[PDB]
Amino acid sequence: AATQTKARTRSKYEIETLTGWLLKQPMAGVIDAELTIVLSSISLACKQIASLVQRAKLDVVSNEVFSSCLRSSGRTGIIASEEEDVPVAVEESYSGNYIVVFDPLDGSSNIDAAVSTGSIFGIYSPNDECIVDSDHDDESQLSAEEQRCVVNVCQPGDNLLAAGYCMYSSSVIFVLTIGKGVYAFTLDPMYGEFVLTSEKIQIPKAGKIYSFNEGNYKMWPDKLKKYMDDLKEPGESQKPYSSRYIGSLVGDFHRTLLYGGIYGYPRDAKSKNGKLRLLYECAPMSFIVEQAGGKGSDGHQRILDIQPTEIHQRVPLYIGSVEEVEKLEKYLA
Amino acid sequence: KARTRSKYEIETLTGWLLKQPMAGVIDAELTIVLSSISLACKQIASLVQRAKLDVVSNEVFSSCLRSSGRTGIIASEEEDVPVAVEESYSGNYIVVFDPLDGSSNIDAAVSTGSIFGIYSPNDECIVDSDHDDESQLSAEEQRCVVNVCQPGDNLLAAGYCMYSSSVIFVLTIGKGVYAFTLDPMYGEFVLTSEKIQIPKAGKIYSFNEGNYKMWPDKLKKYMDDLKEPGESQKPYSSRYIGSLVGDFHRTLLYGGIYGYPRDAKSKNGKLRLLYECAPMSFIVEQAGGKGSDGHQRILDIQPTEIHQRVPLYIGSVEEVEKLEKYLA
Amino acid sequence: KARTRSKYEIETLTGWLLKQPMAGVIDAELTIVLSSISLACKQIASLVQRAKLDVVSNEVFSSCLRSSGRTGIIASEEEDVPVAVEESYSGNYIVVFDPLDGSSNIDAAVSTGSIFGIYSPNDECIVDSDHDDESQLSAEEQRCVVNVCQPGDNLLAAGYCMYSSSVIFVLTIGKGVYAFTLDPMYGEFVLTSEKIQIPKAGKIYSFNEGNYKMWPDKLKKYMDDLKEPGESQKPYSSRYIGSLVGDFHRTLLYGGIYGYPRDAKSKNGKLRLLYECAPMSFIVEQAGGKGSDGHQRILDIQPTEIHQRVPLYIGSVEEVEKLEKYLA
Amino acid sequence: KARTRSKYEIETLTGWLLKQPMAGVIDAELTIVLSSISLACKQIASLVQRAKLDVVSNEVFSSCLRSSGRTGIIASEEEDVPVAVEESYSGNYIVVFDPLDGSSNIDAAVSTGSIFGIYSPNDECIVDSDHDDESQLSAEEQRCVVNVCQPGDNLLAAGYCMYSSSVIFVLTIGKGVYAFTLDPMYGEFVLTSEKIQIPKAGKIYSFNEGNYKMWPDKLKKYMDDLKEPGESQKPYSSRYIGSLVGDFHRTLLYGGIYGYPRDAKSKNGKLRLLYECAPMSFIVEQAGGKGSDGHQRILDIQPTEIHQRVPLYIGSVEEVEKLEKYLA
């Protein structure tokens, strides 16, 4: 016996929920189910952000949800973002054993006439965090703001536990990883739940697609100009690299991740230090494809070795498949 | 909420659609189908939202119309035999409907779109006729079901529906384009922006630059004067999503030029002359700029064949004019 | 192959509602507001799942509507002594919407349907422009109301939407009643019950038995009666949820009686005339049922003044004349 | 004004479900098999709300439990016989699942719900035991059946989900009755009310009064003292939905008495023992109330078959003893 019928949709016979697997997983780790509450909670905030996006300042209130969805998880002892001019997030009594940075959306402009946006999170477990001085409390009245001590370290990216993003576009696929695989989930709209959509989606080896903002070409160095103008001149009877540039970093980093290729953004108008930030979004996505196989380098080296030394500094990013990442590097050298 | 947001939830789609007849004696049937379309799209929308597809979107549209009707006939992307849903159900409408567009990168999923066009047929005739496997040889003296051959003159309304990050429907019936955002929660097409007018200047281009080394030289130089400024000004920024509707949408709102051009292999365009160039032309032409195949404005091209493919360029007039020289 | 309908559409409310103007010459004014209403209910509905209700529901109905081209005034419970809709909107039709059904029960595990009734000022009134603060939720006087207070000679359509474990929209414009359930998939009301008629031998009764003594001499006997199965046959079972719409809804589809007798809380009861009792009695006449206040038929009892409480006896004929057989 | 969003420290069932089973021994097994019960309950409500949805509700259930191999066969509502889950999913623990209670409301449009129970077979055996009226002795039984039977003192977690105007989720376990109001929009169970308990008072009775000419001469008298009491005063209110979970839920909250007395049909009364009245009584118990079959508590019975009904009376520690005083 093995029938069904004409639903051609409702056939969730094996509903492997985000939670289902996300819970069937922690059965191995001394993270005392503190992770789960956080990852699962991020799930919550993303599930809501997906609705803000769609609608009924987007990024400067999507952080407001983070807190609302994490003042319960001691794991996010303290949390973070991009939009704000103050590192606060939750005060005192709700502490844990890790930290998680959250990037509301992915681009001030991006949103205006968007078609794709997302949020990029990466969880850092400073095995020897904060440690500054005694922790004060009790007194009250905080006119000239709520005192606090130090603004803890800038973890690098090799001691990066869990990373992922959630692309609000066409679907709202939750994508996350950990030191044992890459996983993707679609947001089944009706029952508002993130079903497991893909088990360890490994990037293919030949990725014949190129995502670069040629528009500001007369700004890329000649050496780099040698990458652009040359990849669209095959040189043998074969397909040329088709270009796709949606705009959004997630939008683009998801097209690539599933389809090979190489997305990049580099030293141009701004300054050769980069454009995209380092710890807050270049790191969290360089970790994913790293598992998936691909590579991600600033032409010189990989991007989860460089330990940032400030909360904003830009870095050029080039990323996609191995062969197409190691390739381009033989140009800027 | 999310910026403007709720600000708009007053007077849905049908609010306006009933406002049109009340405000312009519209053949009241146009409001039944222009409505079975808001629904028919909403369906494929949560089907595109994930929850076989190229044809399901038709199989929705069909039923979601085969019923009511008002039109008389409907068609598609692959139906070289315009599905005449009974000559019996109507008389004065033909609403070609393109299930989706850019049917490939939907497998990963970022954007997509359904497109359509109401054609009031001055010409009619019936249908039937599909002669089956029996006795006789070649001599096709046939054309099959068509008449899909007269834009500009017959396009009464036109619009597309974008499925991505929002499900913004967009439509025009002569007096300006009007865009509609779908309220997920309380599933209602809420009027968002009215009388959209695409930007007079605009610096955004969307071409498949990746197959540049395969276009006519008259054009290939154009590509370079987008990269290499001269008069000393702002650079021309660029962006290709992968689906017409996303690009066109992104163009109708931000400004630019867009156009899969003709090259060695596709000597004649790609995107079809009726099905996806004409309905999409009458919008950009109702929103400010112009649409054209390099030389002539796209609405003069008497559709003279089946899947007639034809080069297309679309967006702000100023821009489709800079390439007016470069073209030829 | 078992598709057929399993990919159809199923004639939705917005569908059904448009076809009506197809049959008439109505420029869609009534048709505009019915949809404007229907939406107010969807949010007010979806809000009830807890995603001050009585208050919000009233703004939620102000927006979707008020701005409707055909109103000649509109209203909402607490608004003590009239409401007028700004010239800029105008028209004639008036719609009495009393937000929710009760202000105590829900929290339990009940229901809370909303109620509407579009009166049509066979003649009409209102004031002009100006405005002088009136920003308080507390202004009322002896202003010769009347406007809002429109006789049962007017009332041309009526209905409610029950927010139980399934948002049901039921309404009768004047050719039988119709119900449309709300399918959270397609976010739209699928016509589900077409043309209703309550059953005659209404073998069920809903009565707030608890306030027994309060009841007058003649009613209490009738009560022990419905319990002591007269001739020695079938007893009347009980069910009472605690809210108008809900108790009245099983009373519509399924037979029986529901009522709010003129008891010790002074010769009146707890249900108002124009608001809760006038619409509900109109749905029943058409639902092959009957509405009685005790003394005469509610549907034609002069409203006289505001808030005019009137005990209600609502249900299938036979099973209503019965207690009505207690006079003279 | 803010009060719904303004909570902070927000929790979804998952949160709570791990939060406790982290601090208090339990985790893995139980948590998940309660989570995939949360989910099964979100997935079922939609069938009620409308996507004849009884059998289906059991199959939805099996699925959302199969990959949680800590439960064996379970004779659940209407089911003919408990099925084992292909080994490996070695379920050393048994849960009884009750899809839709009040066999009627589902087509009647009104409150309905699901009730479950987690029995930890202190004496390992979670295997089938086919029972189809064969033989054994020529007389009657001697030995125990299916094991499914597990006394109320040894049932760890039990709760119910109400699909009424809201999908409130009530659960209790070792501490109290917690309730989570499914957030319609995003699909998550939020905790609304921590460790609560009835209010001792109980001005609400909820029995099927209309069946009066039938109850025992001792209960029959009792009802009259509810309507016309000693020192009289503020009478009782008779709020009765009829659906077992709706009644039990307005009760557990507000406070009152709710009962299914002995009747005519047979001393059973109707409601089943460990499938329906046992967990409800187990919950209402720690919720502070009391539950009993008039003269003896439910958390002190164990039948000799699948369907051994039992009169049920549940309500506050007061109301219950009151009717208990009419016990000779």
Swiss-Prot record, chain A:
Residues that bind Mg(2+) 3: D103, D106, E281
GO biological process: fructose 1,6-bisphosphate metabolic process; fructose 6-phosphate metabolic process; fructose metabolic process; gluconeogenesis; reductive pentose-phosphate cycle; sucrose biosynthetic process
A single GO cellular-component term on record: cytoplasm
Residues that bind Mg(2+) 2: E82, D103, L105
Cofactor(s) needed: Mg(2+)
CC cofactor note: Binds 3 Mg(2+) ions per subunit.
One GO molecular-function entry: metal ion binding
Disulfide partners: C149-C154
Family: Belongs to the FBPase class 1 family.
Quaternary structure and interacting proteins, as annotated: Homotetramer.
Record protein name field: Fructose-1,6-bisphosphatase, chloroplastic
Organism of derivation: Spinacia oleracea
Lineage: Eukaryota, Viridiplantae, Streptophyta, Embryophyta, Tracheophyta
